[PDB]
Amino acid sequence: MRIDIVTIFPACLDPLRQSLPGKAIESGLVDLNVHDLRRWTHDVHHSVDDAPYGGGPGMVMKAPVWGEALDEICSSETLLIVPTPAGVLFTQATAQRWTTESHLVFACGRYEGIDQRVVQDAARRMRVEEVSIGDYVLPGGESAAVVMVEAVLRLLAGVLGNGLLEGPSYTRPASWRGLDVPEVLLSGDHARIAAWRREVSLQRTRERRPDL
Amino acid sequence: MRIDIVTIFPACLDPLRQSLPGKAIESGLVDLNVHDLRRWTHDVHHSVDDAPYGGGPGMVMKAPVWGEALDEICSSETLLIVPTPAGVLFTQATAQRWTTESHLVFACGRYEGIDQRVVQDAARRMRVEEVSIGDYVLPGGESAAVVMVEAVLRLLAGGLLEGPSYTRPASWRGLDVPEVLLSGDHARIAAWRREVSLQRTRERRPDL
Incomplete structure (x- = not known):
């Protein structure tokens, strides 16, 4: 399996280089690449966010920056996962199903999330799933990606035979x-x-x- | 708020020093201490686990080592939380409620889990809640603790x-x-x- 996680806080993904998923990666069961979204910005401030149309609280992540990142990282066989409160619930059965995937890409939002058009545009090319790990609100999608990858790689690494x-x-x-x-x-x-x-x-x- | 997290993989808790929870901690809103469980072991290999009574796959975390750790770290005001798939679901309402707590202690289990008597013994002295962040199985409780602390410190940072x-x-x-x-x-x-x-x-x- 190949996994990419795109984020403005790459360090939040450091537990994935440890213990069980760390072993899965070292062994060549899984390639994991963590990317700083800011590397696809072209202005001086490297800005990834801007005020929402129609008003509201907070900032929204700009589509052009995300669009470029995913253009480069994804193919048409990629499964794109966007951790969000507004997603369907992640479960063990989702995790089991995702062990069959060759390429998982995690697009980790911050602020109020990611301009919706990124997912609409991505869905022209690849399969996309908006997913929540549970009914609670986190400051970003990174620690939700850690949860979901750890669930997947646990199964991938092989578990002992015993709702x-x-x-x-x-x-x-x-x-x-x-x-x-x-x-x-x-x-x-x-x-x-x-x-x-x-x-x-x-x-x-x-x-x-x-x-x- | 004061938070202790006890674990055999302290480095897994490093995301809590970044971004929003990092700011909460630096500002003195929240004290966070991450402890290596192995520091309360007394044998040569610093072992924290042993085979389960009645058979099965995998190992169970020993009660005497957890008992000592929690003896030292917890008071009678502490809320002790044990991430586990056998727990009630963590929600926004849980997170909101936990901002009112003065002392959260997270006991992060590995393998098949922690000998049940640690929680039974702890509950003589302090309030205890067994909590699951969702319907899926992780190799350990550390990344569930990250999720829970992040939810709580988000609210603390202010259908x-x-x-x-x-x-x-x-x-x-x-x-x-x-x-x-x-x-x-x-x-x-x-x-x-x-x-x-x-x-x-x-x-x-x-x-x-």
Whole structure:
């Protein structure tokens, strides 16, 4: 897989060179390139943003700057991802599906986001997905790209064989500060253990994620 | 606000020293301390994990090492947060509420997670919340902590989906800024924005 992330704060992507995704990249499973959007500006201030048509709060990222960057970085086989509050929700199934992609490009917004015409124009050439990692507002799309890449590269790196929430886990010691490991886990009975884990997962899922 | 994040990968928390959260911290709005969990280990290999009781794939983080860390870092006023896919969903309302907290402690788990008794023991002393930033699985809790702190410090720095934005020029690659936004008619503009927000919200997020 090849991944490009375009941003005005390249350093925010530094966790992607660490631990699990760092290993995936070193191993040649994935090429990752992080680009400073400002390199496609041509004025003295290297400005990437300007006031919104129709008024409103804040600034909008200019289309011509983004247009040039994506012209150079993307092909017609690229999947372009734009992290935004206004996107459909990112889920495990999205992550699994994106392991089949050869080229992911992340266009990380700042301010009020990116002139909408960038995505309309990009969508003439390549597939585009506007995606939110959750129902909360971040100052930019960078740490959302970190989340999404880490989800993808986890799967890509290969996970061990083993919709409910995961149950609790325990390891040594068997008793700690007057708190005991549930005797079933010490019993060696794989049937009793599996049913116990199923029971607790079910109970958790009802309490914390009734939408599931 | 004072924030501690405990982790075996401290460098993953480096984005919090940049941009908007960086400014919050420099200004003395927020103290942030990032701690390496391994500093509370006492054996030669500084081990933080061991095999799970009752079998399974992967390792579990040991309670005694987490117990010591949190003993030293937390008080009875602390809100302890454990990022985990088994948690309730993090939302804007969570973020807003957490700006009222004096002490946030993030316990970032790795592998299969943290021995459950760390949270049970902690909850004797302090408030605790197990929280998921979304329905997907990450290798560790550090990038979930980045998301959560960034949401909170954004609010500290002071229902419909956001509609599209536009800036200059008025026409670009054959694509025009919708005439209403050029019209200066605030009545027509605010009605148009409502129309499009609602249409977006239906199309992508009918749960809203």
